[PDB]
């Protein structure tokens, strides 16, 4: 699996440091194209970053900051596109990688494939053991069209550098090694050429190429400038539709593709939504609507009528800038079955904000979320009323899509709570991103959740530390109800099973339905207890009805 989503945490420091490296491993392990930003921060002196050795392309910016590791192994990184830029300016940013006062800290940049920076510039500052950055011909790396192609570099040092390998033609090198010489691709080309593989006109790259090439065709690119149409580099993706040019009537085009990142795609990847206009997104464009199409796949169809009203969450529409659920906005979710956006519960939710007269959210008010079935963004709970021992107001939440992730990484975060179990008894799917559950001191029934089953891609995981130790829980006589298949549950009681062993009466696991010897006599329909018409004569040790209606009764 070549493509993965990067983070969005910047210089903020990891909310749970003990699982920080593990998050990074899971994210980038065996990934080559990084949608979004590669942020490598706060990595301790010894950290094995082997998992990064496969990244070719970073879509956003690269931030390497606040690390003590001597080396980050990004030798295969070729292109960084700069779709978003650190500090709105930098495609690459290397900062404060030293010891917080044998010494730790980044020593060589070792970016030996970095041949292309498409947009934005380079920031290098406060790295006391770093060598050879003042050696690179940065003009060559920045694309011909990079309008923010700038440099800010610091060469303050606490060690003496060695010269580049004698094998390096000029002063140029990404490190002490011979395989570290900077390879030039722009400043040494014949004619107008944007990129090349040598001095000769025949060494020129195709106009559609991006990092350089192995030959003159558009199938020889090291990277695509615009799109990767199944091996061939092009400017656009094949239209979804073929036109007449006189009538301008359209047949569907079987060759047609959707734009996803920097590649043409037959169908948009899992969590995304295809678009009548030929794209893949996470928010339907205006006057379009999310519909569960005739597969199961989500899709953005046009609305004939005005689009039906929808519950927006945090980070969305009129709550775009809102940090948390408060008494000031909680009623807004009343009745909502699906929230387009995210919900975050912070300490400021529950202790009020005096400042701007916002009453503390009282716990009974959380009952609004009892109708909620789906969240498209993320759930974030860093505070929760002490009087409530579980998240069972989310009782009916079936999916958290993760189309928006917290810090760009986590779709479910539960930290610092002192709930005793989760109680999210309907949660069947975390659509993308990680679950992080740390520092909930009384929390049990974590190991009982089959997280394994909630996920939808290999980069997902439950990161967890500093909760109540499982042996301490069992030791306090705590367990899935006997009626929970394979031992899995979200809490105590027959209501909390992931899959009901016998039969479902309401949301309750029961050993027996009420078929022969019950109070309200019931019928079974695909492992479910369902009542007859209240006016069906109960039978003595026999079937009372065949169905729910009056024609199905026995008398």
């Amino acid at each position: 699996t070549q493509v993965c989503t990067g983070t969005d945490m910047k210089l903020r420091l990891p909310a749970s440091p003990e699982t920080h490296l593990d998050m990074l491993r899971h994210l980038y392990q065996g990934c080559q194209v990084v949608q979004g930003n590669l942020e490598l921060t706060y990595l301790p002196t010894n950290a094995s970053l082997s998992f990064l050795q496969d990244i070719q392309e970073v879509q956003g910016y690269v931030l390497i900051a606040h690390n003590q590791v001597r080396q980050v192994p990004l030798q295969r990184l070729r292109i960084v596109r700069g779709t978003q830029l650190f500090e709105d300016n930098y495609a690459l940013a290397v900062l404060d990688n030293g010891d917080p006062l044998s010494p730790g800290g980044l020593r060589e940049l070792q970016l030996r494939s970095l041949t292309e920076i498409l947009k934005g510039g380079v920031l290098i500052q406060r790295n006391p053991q770093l060598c050879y950055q003042d050696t690179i011909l940065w003009k060559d790396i920045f694309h011909k069209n990079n309008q923010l192609a700038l440099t800010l570099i610091d060469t303050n040092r606490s060690r003496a550098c060695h010269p580049c390998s004698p094998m390096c033609k000029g002063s140029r090198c990404w490190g002490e090694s011979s395989e570290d010489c900077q390879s030039l691709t722009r400043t040494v080309c014949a004619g107008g050429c944007a990129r090349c593989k040598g001095p000769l006109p025949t060494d020129c790259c195709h106009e559609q190429c991006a990092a350089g090439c192995t030959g003159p065709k558009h199938s020889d690119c090291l990277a695509c400038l615009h799109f990767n149409h199944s091996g061939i580099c092009e400017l656009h993706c094949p239209a979804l539709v073929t036109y007449n040019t006189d009538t301008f009537e359209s047949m569907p085009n079987p060759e047609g593709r959707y734009t996803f990142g920097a590649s043409c795609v037959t169908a948009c990847p899992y969590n995304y939504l295809s678009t009548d206009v030929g794209s893949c997104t996470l928010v339907c464009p205006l006057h379009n609507q999310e519909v569960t199409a005739e597969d199961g796949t989500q899709r953005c169809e046009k609305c004939s009528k005005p689009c039906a009203r929808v519950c927006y969450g945090l980070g969305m529409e009129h709550l775009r800038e809102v940090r948390a659920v408060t008494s000031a906005n909680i009623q807004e979710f009343a009745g909502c079955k699906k929230i387009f956006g995210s919900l975050a519960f912070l300490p400021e939710s529950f202790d009020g904000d005096p400042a701007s007269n916002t009453a503390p959210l009282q716990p009974e008010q959380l009952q609004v979320f009892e109708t909620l079935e789906e969240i498209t963004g993320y759930l974030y709970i860093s505070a929760w009323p002490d009087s409530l021992p579980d998240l069972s107001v989310f009782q009916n939440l079936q999916v958290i899509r993760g189309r928006i992730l917290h810090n760009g990484a986590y779709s479910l975060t539960l930290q610092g709570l002192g709930i005793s179990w989760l109680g999210l008894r309907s949660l069947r799917e975390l659509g993308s991103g990680l679950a992080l559950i740390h520092h909930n001191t009384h929390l049990c029934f974590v190991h009982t959740v089959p997280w394994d089953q909630l996920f939808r891609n290999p980069h997902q995981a439950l990161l967890h530390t500093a909760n109540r130790p499982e042996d301490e829980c069992v030791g306090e006589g705590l367990a899935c109800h006997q009626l929970c298949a394979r031992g899995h549950c979200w809490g105590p009681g027959p209501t909390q099973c992931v899959n009901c062993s016998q039969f479902l009466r309401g949301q309750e696991c029961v050993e027996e339905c009420r078929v022969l010897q019950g109070l309200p006599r019931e019928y079974v329909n695909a492992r479910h207890c369902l009542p007859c018409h209240p006016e069906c004569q109960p039978q003595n040790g026999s079937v009372t009805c065949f169905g729910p209606e009056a024609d199905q009764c026995v008398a």
Partner: antibody
Amino acid sequence: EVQLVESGGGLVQPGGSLRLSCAASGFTFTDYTMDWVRQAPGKGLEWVADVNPNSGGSIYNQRFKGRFTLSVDRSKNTLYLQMNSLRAEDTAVYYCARNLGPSFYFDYWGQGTLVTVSS
Amino acid sequence: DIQMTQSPSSLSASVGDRVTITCKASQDVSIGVAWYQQKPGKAPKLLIYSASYRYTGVPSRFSGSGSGTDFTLTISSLQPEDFATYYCQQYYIYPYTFGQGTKVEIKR
């Protein structure tokens, strides 16, 4: 806030060439088609064409087949309308607008750049 | 090619009057009509789409009605800003064509 800004208007001699830009912000550019609509002094609105950022393909008014050409540069969320063989009748304000539902009515319209074709 | 014919060409009303403009399609265009407002120097604003539906935030007094050939815009009670030009446009069928326009002007 959604915004669109036309630029590149001016005075050209009949026959001459000209190119107009439309730069866009406040929305996902790659999620909408965009259009040129023009307005001759004192007259009304004539639709020109509809370019798609994903496909690169335009849907154009037959009046202009082979003179006006459309281009997108999604790297800078910019459209380009390229006019060749310019004549009097082309002298107008050239609005750039957003094709809404990729049906053909438009919500946000730019300020519009003026083109004057005279000797 | 399709013509949208607007009536009247210009009209003079005072503040507070109800104001109705007609737009007549030469050819059945189901409900594929929008309505635009435009002032001197300014660009068009979309007011009605799908013949009868208010665009986001367009004040309630604006209403579009009709289907097929005959279409109508009605400002329930004129307000000082409304004095401007109103175009209709069919988008149902290619090529997309706008009406020749209606000037609403302040009477004294």
